[PDB]
Design a protein around this ligand. Structure first.
Ligand SMILES: C/C=C/C(=O)SCCNC(=O)CCNC(=O)[C@H](O)C(C)(C)COP(=O)(O)OP(=O)(O)OC[C@H]1O[C@@H](n2cnc3c(N)ncnc32)[C@H](O)[C@@H]1OP(=O)(O)O
Ligand SMILES: CCCCCCCCCCCC(=O)SCCNC(=O)CCNC(=O)[C@H](O)C(C)(C)COP(=O)(O)O
Ligand SMILES: [Fe+3]
Ligand SMILES: [Zn+2]
Lengths: 210, 233, 123, 265, 87, 249, 29
């Protein structure tokens, strides 16, 4: 049987809280990092200096730690989760290292991305998978659990397969992509003053009700 | 331009100062309501002078994100959870076009890989749930399958169909009346006339559905829910 | 996927200061210290870099001679660090700096002894 | 209180007026270009076509989720951040103890192209992964839909069956019991080991436990949020040496302690 | 110089003697890869008494988990040669 | 060095500055004012030389920030005591100027150290890639290290300038040679930190928490002093000349 | 209508007294 609650909140004037602490697990956001207003960060989540999380992304650290590294970006509508343990037996926190570009609409669960990698749009990285440094994945790639992308290589497909070895110039261009995305995020960071003015709307809504 | 940007910056200094003063005044009266964490999500967000231009007969779900220079035409619809980001370039959506739930329509974030292509969506177009459009042109009366990804440079010619879950590689052209699908996208078959009829009729049915959802969202916010949230213990 | 992290996994056994044997896991190409910090056998906060210039033998481990031939010989800097960090200022022949030991496939099953932690957090 | 109280209140009124006037002047200097942030108009539960969602008492619905129309969600289920359950042209039914994970879309169809159009049925103890898309299909009990997977209309995922993460399950495809399918298009991969069946059950139960802590946090009021923020700051670090000098033992307040069923051990 | 482990060559003979000296063990079936149960005609009770004798010999305790893994000579040897408390 | 390392870092910062001011006041009023003469100044001459040499070598051997700062302070007291050794008005004035500039520089350096102690800085190698993670902090710290090394026109040059002025004034060329060699050694182990923060590309980076307002304000002021003192040094020169004269009248 | 926290009100008075007193201190020196 489905017995409902008459006190269930159907419209919340506050909206969804961006920062969801869980016990003592408080998401930690650097002062020079950009997080979009409708991003949800929950639990053991650290967002480091110069990084950016864009609209619609969810980072839920309720089962393990989630880290976004220096000048790394987690783009639109990505979901980053983590598990208690990995099938590989290694620690199962999700580590996104520095100068990493995670293409929009990507799903990450207990994966390690070493510094200076590009993850293609609409990609899936499963539990215990490892992307080694200076590697690139094409859009739509699917990395099964415990799989590995060796360094200096371009992979792609469902499931992901080797395509070609990267040239030096291509690998020099990866941190430039991360830096350019951080430069873009600076423009969005500049649009928000430390406080909002919603509380005034709430105040007049309260007054117009007595 | 530069002068407008300087006035926008100096304006933010005056605003920062005024809001700080208001917080001081509330602190002297013993009020802490400004510390409340309320959502700063804006359905329509500007990046300096690049603002969205939305037609009055276009439904936009409140939880959708429309950022920068975005044009939505009459009778079009942006459903729940969608994101449209035209900042480095423009994003234009034709009339009678439905962008379904959790779709992402955006342009390249940086010009590192060359000039940033705009995203053009034609008329009476259907974009399926959770589809990714990235700097591509999608002509009139076309069908983008749900979960599909279109990369920059792609052109979907009129009456083209992209199958659900397809991955249309960069600079691929989808000819008229063809169904392409898979990763990478490849020609599957030709489009039948019944499916063309379904394309047009589905765009019409979603315009009527958008109207119904717009009336239920424009209904005034219920006070009882507000008082229940306020008086919780 | 033709390339698994199991290709780089190295199986290993570490004996903690209370004499209990544990089976630990590490990746080839990474230092023994990284594998040791995965389980908290050595506090990662005490040795965050894998550089000999950021080491006061907080990574020191003892290894039997059978596994000591499968390793490059200890460098002058390594022995200097070990000897000076000894309380008796004596170089132990079975001591190796865990930050300078790179795991390889030929070290499968290597057994390592982890001594008591030295103090490392300078006020 | 008193005369000094009233004088300070009045002066605070003047300062507030000045602050808001300065804010208006600053908005004018910006050219009025910035769109003002407003009160939230997103409705977690909404009616459409005189259809109201029927949601059990013990269901976590993330405030950012969208439950619209003719949706039934049973006991112990959970709808996570960014999920959209749009039951506007047909019915959506969710069983008991079923998790619909972040950013997932569940939709129905009024009339499919060919064949009998059916509502969306999701059975008991079902796990649906992040950013899955369920459209006019049936998922039976104790099934597993992987994250990023896509079920088209007429698909039937049977009991103790799995759809691999990222799959595209074509229309009218039937995933039989005991198998895992995957790829684009989705096809048979291998049989499901019993350990994986246990994994599926454990996933459902773990998400039941996770939903509790998330639901408890998301429903706190402003005052309780402030109380817990102060407490969290208070207990973030420690000086147990000075405490032992004072002869006291600071204890973590219970509102900052998570239940053991969600802890990694 | 210092050391933490007893040389393996020093360990094998020490385990070889204590099994030979142990009763019900004729010093002819005591090959260094011998199983106390199968090759030495020792019941489970005799096998428990052998790990005990090695514990005393090397002066260190052996946990139940590892007490059982010592079912053969070569196995007893390896464990002590890599155990640092053995002295 | 052992007490400076082992003590809590704010204690190390306090012990680095104030006791030296007070003990040098005592030394002036006791010795410069009493009258045994040559031996007393030879004591300080030989100890100054030993301090410069030993401080330079030992600092060159250090891998931890706090020990490096301790040995640098030992070397600098050697440089300051060269002024007491000469036993003239300009000697006392230069001692006072050296004390003031060393105190401000040390306050700068320990403000930075206390700022980095929130992420537990211990080794010089921990400062790798700080010019990427916090470029303005790496510049402020590089300015302090070049000032410690005495590179003009930073405030640290002032004290170095005197060392050679007295060495060629009191007629002491072995002191001059020691000063040249130990200055070069000091420059090396100071610019090693600038190399670590700017030129190195480590595999693992340490991200540091931003400092609080107190330390940022103090750092900004001391850094402006360090870069710009040689533009308007008149008040310190006048006041130290006043103090040197007021020792006797 | 009224600010209740008395200690806050006394602190406000002290801050105002300090500001007016500093201004007077400059004005009379
Ligand atoms: C309590 C908490 C509960 C949760 O929140 S978990 C829900 C979110 N997690 C997930 O959705 C991920 C669950 N696990 C899986 O989906 C997984 O993949 C899976 C369940 C198919 C199985 O993945 P496996 O690690 O077991 O891979 P296999 O070796 O068994 O399969 C062989 C084959 O399948 C292919 N491979 C396997 N997995 C997949 C897929 N999916 N797709 C495509 N291709 C694959 C691959 O090609 C492999 O080699 P090739 O034949 O050479 O191609
Ligand atoms: C310091 C002195 C104080 C302490 C001493 C106190 C007195 C000690 C005596 C008390 C203990 C008992 O008798 S308790 C009784 C012990 N005997 C039994 O368990 C009966 C069943 N027999 C068997 O299981 C086997 O014959 C057996 C040989 C045991 C092993 O099996 P194997 O055949 O497969 O080796
Ligand atoms: Fe080390
Ligand atoms: Zn639909």
């Amino acid at each position: 049987q489905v017995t409902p609650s008459p006190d269930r909140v159907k419209w919340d004037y506050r909206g969804q809280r961006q920062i969801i602490p869980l016990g003592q697990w408080l998401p930690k956001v650097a002062v020079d990092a950009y997080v979009a207003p409708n991003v949800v960060l929950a639990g053991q989540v650290t967002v480091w200096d110069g990084s950016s999380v864009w609209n619609g992304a969810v980072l839920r650290g309720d089962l393990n730690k989630i880290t976004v590294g220096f000048c790394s970006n987690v783009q639109e509508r990505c979901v980053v989760h983590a598990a208690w343990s990995s099938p590989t037996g290694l620690p199962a926190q999700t580590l996104i290292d520095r100068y990493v570009t995670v293409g929009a609409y990507s799903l990450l669960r207990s994966c390690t991305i070493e510094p200076e990698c590009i993850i293609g749009q609409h990609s899936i990285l499963m539990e215990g998978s490892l992307v080694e440094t200076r590697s690139i994945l094409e859009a739509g790639s699917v990395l099964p659990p415990g799989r590995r992308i060796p360094s200096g290589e371009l992979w792609g497909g469902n499931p992901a397969r080797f395509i070609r070895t990267l040239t030096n110039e291509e690998t020099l261009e990866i941190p430039k992509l991360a830096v350019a995305i951080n430069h873009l995020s600076g423009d969005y960071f500049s649009e928000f003053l430390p406080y909002s003015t919603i509380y005034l709307e709430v105040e007049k809504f309260k007054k117009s009700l007595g | 331009g530069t002068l407008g940007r300087a006035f926008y910056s100096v304006g933010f200094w005056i605003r920062e100062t005024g809001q700080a003063l208001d917080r001081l005044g509330c602190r002297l009266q013993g009020k802490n309501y400004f510390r409340e964490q309320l959502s700063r999500h804006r359905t329509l967000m500007n990046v300096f002078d690049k603002a969205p231009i939305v037609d009055k007969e276009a439904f936009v779900a409140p939880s959708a994100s429309v950022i920068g220079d975005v044009h939505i035409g009459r009778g079009s619809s942006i459903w729940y959870g969608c994101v449209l980001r035209g900042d480095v370039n423009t994003v234009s959506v034709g009339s009678g076009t439905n962008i379904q739930d959790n779709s992402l329509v955006h342009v390249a974030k940086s010009n590192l890989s060359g000039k940033v292509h705009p995203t053009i969506i034609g008329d009476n177009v259907t974009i399926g749930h959770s589809a990714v459009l990235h700097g591509c042109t999608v002509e009139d009366e076309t069908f983008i399958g749900m979960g599909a990804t279109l990369l920059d440079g792609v052109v979907v010619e009129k009456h083209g169909m992209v199958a659900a879950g397809a991955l249309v590689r960069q600079n691929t052209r989808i000819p008229s009346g063809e169904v392409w699908g898979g990763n990478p996208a490849r020609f599957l078959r030709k489009l039948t006339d019944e499916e063309i009829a379904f394309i047009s009729q589905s765009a019409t049915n979603y315009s009527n559905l958008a109207q119904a959802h717009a009336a239920e969202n424009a209904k005034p916010l219920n006070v009882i829910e507000f008082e229940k949230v306020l008086r919780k213990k | 996927g033709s390339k698994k992290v199991s290709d780089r996994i190295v199986k290993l056994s570490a004996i903690d200061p209370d004499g209990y044997k544990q089976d630990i896991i590490g990746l080839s190409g990474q230092t023994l210290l990284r594998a040791l910090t995965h389980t908290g056998l050595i506090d990662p906060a005490s040795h965050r870099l894998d550089d000999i210039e950021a080491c006061s033998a907080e990574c020191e481990v003892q290894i039997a001679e059978e596994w000591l031939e499968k390793l490059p010989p200890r460098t002058y800097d390594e022995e200097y660090v070990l000897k000076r960090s000894s309380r008796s200022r004596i170089l132990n022949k079975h001591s190796r700096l865990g930050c300078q030991v790179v795991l390889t496939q030929e070290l499968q099953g290597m057994v390592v002894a982890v001594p008591e932690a030295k103090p490392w957090d300078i006020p | 209180m008193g005369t000094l109280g009233r004088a300070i209140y009045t002066v605070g009124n003047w300062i507030r007026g000045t602050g808001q006037a300065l804010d208006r002047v600053g908005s004018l200097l910006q050219g009025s270009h910035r769109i003002e942030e407003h009160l939230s108009r997103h409705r977690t539960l909404m009616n459409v076509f005189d259809k109201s969602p029927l949601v059990d008492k013990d269901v976590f619905v993330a405030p950012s989720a969208s439950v619209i129309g003719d949706v039934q969600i049973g006991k112990g289920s959970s709808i996570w951040y960014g999920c959209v359950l749009r039951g506007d042209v047909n019915n959506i039914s969710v069983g008991s103890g079923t998790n619909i994970q972040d950013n997932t879309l569940v939709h129905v169809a009024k009339t499919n192209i060919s064949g009998k159009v059916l509502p969306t049925l999701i059975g008991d103890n079902v796990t649906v992964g992040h950013s899955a898309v369920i459209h006019g299909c049936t998922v039976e009990d104790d099934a597993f839909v992987g994250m990023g997977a896509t079920l088209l209309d007429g698909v039937v995922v049977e009991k103790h069956a799995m759809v691999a993460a990222g799959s595209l399950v074509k229309q009218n495809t039937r995933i039989p019991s005991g198998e895992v399918w995957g790829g684009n298009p989705a096809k048979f991969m291998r049989k499901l080991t019993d350990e994986e069946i246990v994994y599926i059950s454990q996933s459902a139960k773990n998400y039941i436990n996770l939903a509790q802590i998330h639901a408890s946090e998301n429903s706190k009021s402003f005052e309780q949020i402030e109380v817990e923020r102060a407490l969290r700051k208070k207990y973030a670090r420690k000086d147990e040496d000075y405490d032992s000098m004072l002869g006291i033992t600071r204890e973590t307040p219970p509102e900052l302690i998570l239940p053991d069923n969600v802890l990694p051990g | 110089v210092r050391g933490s482990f007893l040389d393996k060559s020093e360990v094998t003979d020490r385990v070889l003697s204590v099994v030979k000296n142990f009763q019900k063990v004729d010093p002819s079936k005591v090959t260094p890869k011998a199983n106390f149960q199968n090759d030495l005609g020792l019941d489970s009770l005799d096998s428990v008494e052998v790990v005990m004798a090695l514990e005393e010999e090397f002066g260190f305790e052996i946990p139940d988990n590892e007490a059982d893994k010592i079912q053969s000579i070569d196995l007893a040897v390896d464990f002590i040669a890599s155990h640092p408390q053995a002295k | 060095p052992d007490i400076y390392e082992g003590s809590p870092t704010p204690v190390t910062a306090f012990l680095s500055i104030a006791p030296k001011i007070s003990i040098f006041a005592n030394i002036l009023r006791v010795f410069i004012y009493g009258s045994y003469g040559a031996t007393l100044q030879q004591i300080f001459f030989f100890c100054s030389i030993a301090s410069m040499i030993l401080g330079a070598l030992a600092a060159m051997a250090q891998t931890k920030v706090k020990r490096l700062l301790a040995y640098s302070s030992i070397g600098h007291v050697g440089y300051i005591c060269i002024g007491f050794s000469c036993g003239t008005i300009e000697g006392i004035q230069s001692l006072l100027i050296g004390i003031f500039i060393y105190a401000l520089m040390t306050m700068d350096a320990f403000a930075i150290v206390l700022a980095l102690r929130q992420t537990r800085v211990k080794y010089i190698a921990d400062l790798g890639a700080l010019a990427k993670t916090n470029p303005i902090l790496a510049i402020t710290f590089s300015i302090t290290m070049f000032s410690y090394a005495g590179i003009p026109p930073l405030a640290g040059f002032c004290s170095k300038f005197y060392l050679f002025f007295a060495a060629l004034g009191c007629g002491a060329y072995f002191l001059a040679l020691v000063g040249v060699v130990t200055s070069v050694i000091g420059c090396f182990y100071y610019i090693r930190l600038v190399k670590r923060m700017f030129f190195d590309t480590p595999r693992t980076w340490i991200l540091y928490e931003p400092m609080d307002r107190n330390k940022s304000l103090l750092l900004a002021m001391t850094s402006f002093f360090i870069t710009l003192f040689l533009l308007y040094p008149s008040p310190l020169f006048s006041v130290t000349h006043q103090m040197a004269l007021s020792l006797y009248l | 209508k009224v600010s209740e926290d008395k200690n806050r009100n006394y602190a406000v008075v002290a801050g105002v007294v300090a500001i007016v007193g500093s201004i007077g201190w400059y004005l009379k020196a």
